[PDB]
Amino acid sequence: SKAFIDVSAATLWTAPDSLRPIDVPSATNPVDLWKWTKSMTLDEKLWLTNANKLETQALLGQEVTVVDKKGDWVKVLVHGQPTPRNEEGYPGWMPEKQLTYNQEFADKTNEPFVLVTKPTAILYINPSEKHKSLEVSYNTRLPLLSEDTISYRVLLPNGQKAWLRKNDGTFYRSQNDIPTPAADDLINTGKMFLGLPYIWAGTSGFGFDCSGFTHTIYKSHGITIPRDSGPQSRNGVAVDKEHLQKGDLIFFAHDQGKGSVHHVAMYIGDGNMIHSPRAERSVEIIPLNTPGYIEEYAGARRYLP
Secondary structure: OEEEEOOOEEEEEOOOOOOOHHHHHHHOOOOOHHHHHHHOOHHHHHHHHHOOOEEEEEEOOOEEEEEEEEOOEEEEEEOOOOEOOEOOOEEEEEEHHHEEOOHHHHHOOOOOEEEEOOOEEEEEEOOOOOOOEEEEEOOOEEEEEEEOOOEEEEEOOOOOEEEEEHHHEEEEOOHHHOOOOOHHHHHHHHHOOOOOEOOOOOEEOOEEOHHHHHHHHHHOOOOOOOOOHHHHOOOOEEEOHHHOOOOOEEEEEHHHHOOOEEEEEEEEEOOEEEEOOOOOOEOEEEEOOOOOHHHHEEEEEEOOO
16 A cells, blocks of 8 residues: 655665664654764675665655565555566665655645755744754655745645745656756756765665665656666666767676676766765766776666657
């Protein structure tokens, strides 16, 4: 059955009940994802990848299909994150307490919405008995209720009403009606995140992995590409090295480009690329001709019409 993400961003696990104590702030409702990421050492971040712990992250209001339940954990398919693993959505395990269902929100899912357009922004719940607020990610979509000279009012997945400053968001009729981006729009979007530390499976303005970054940049501009780097590398139109253009996605694969794809970056022209590269680093711009990367070059895809 149908449910909605009830936290700024939910982290989905490859198995239920796999949290360390340091991961607790990712699993509560509400979350504290700055506490989560900023508290971790490098080794603690790398464990997420090397012990194969995470699947993806889903944002506030994103719809999921609940498919299994083990204790306090549910297995869900995240709609809007394409993967060859499952035709309905991206699979993984998350705490049930991070999901909600409100009929009014469910009915308004196909109405015009506000898309959050800064890396993160503050939503103010109004009315709220305890004057609550929520820091939300870039690419969060909530149904638009009303607009004044300074703000948009929106509906939260739990049925509460909230507002954000107009400068923190944009409204659109639907995903399908987000205008087609120019390559520079995509680049400018990526640039907003320069210096944001990497996290495995990161799919929000609280931290990205390389494919979560590319998926999020495209999705926020109306183009849904696969969640993961391997599938990203086999969708869109194949581009040859001599024909690289701004916005093109560039892929790197193990064994000198011959094996599995494990990195993706976006070409930004003049020989440079932007990416969220690895746990040791942050969203950054580097040359395509960087040692390591250049030997693993495994092709390029174009997603812009």
